[PDB]
Amino acid sequence: RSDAEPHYLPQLRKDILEVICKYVQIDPEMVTVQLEQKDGDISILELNVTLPEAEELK
Amino acid sequence: RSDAEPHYLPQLRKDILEVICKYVQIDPEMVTVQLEQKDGDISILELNVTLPEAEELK
């Protein structure tokens, strides 16, 4: 797990998953996660959030 | 603001920003946000997180 070096980066992404859950309801397999980097000692953690339909919830 | 219809989607992304702050420290202009959709009544909220260098923090 290359994201284990910090131990917080993956803690925040999983948090946004529970966060979107507190306000909505989606699975972890629906949210993608991908880290990138720039030529200047910089990183870029991007995460896709595929939300499904919704209507039964009011 | 097309993301104002739900009022929670943008609340979770801003939360992950503060979350990465509680465990680290970055600006909102460093994290990108982009929503997408599929041909099946589905959405895809992707957000880039450009993290800067780090060392002064122990």
- CATH (domain of A29): 3.30.1070.10
End-to-end CA distance of chain A: 39
Q: Are strands A42-51 and B31-38 parallel, antiparallel or unpaired?
A: unpaired
CB contact under 8 A, B19 and A12: yes
CB B30 within 8 A of CB B51: yes
Angle at the Cα of A11 from the Cα atoms of A10 and A16, rounded to 5 degrees? 95
Q: Order of strands, edge to edge, in the sheet holding A31-38?
A: A31-38, A42-51, B42-51, B31-38
Please name the member of A16, A24, A44 whose beta carbon is closest to the beta carbon of B15: A16
* Structure determination method: NMR
DSSP string of A28-47, one letter each residue: GGGEEEEEEEETTTEEEEEE
Q: How far apart are CA B30 and CA B36, in angstroms?
A: 20
Q: How far apart are CA A14 and CA B2, in angstroms?
A: 25
CB contact under 8 A, B51 and A38: no
DSSP 8-state code for residue A53: -
CB A31 within 8 A of CB A19: no
Domain interval for residue B16: 1-58
Domain tally, chain A: 1
Instruction: For residue A47, count other CB atoms closer than 10 A to its CB.
Output: 20
Location of structure tokens 């870029």:
A44
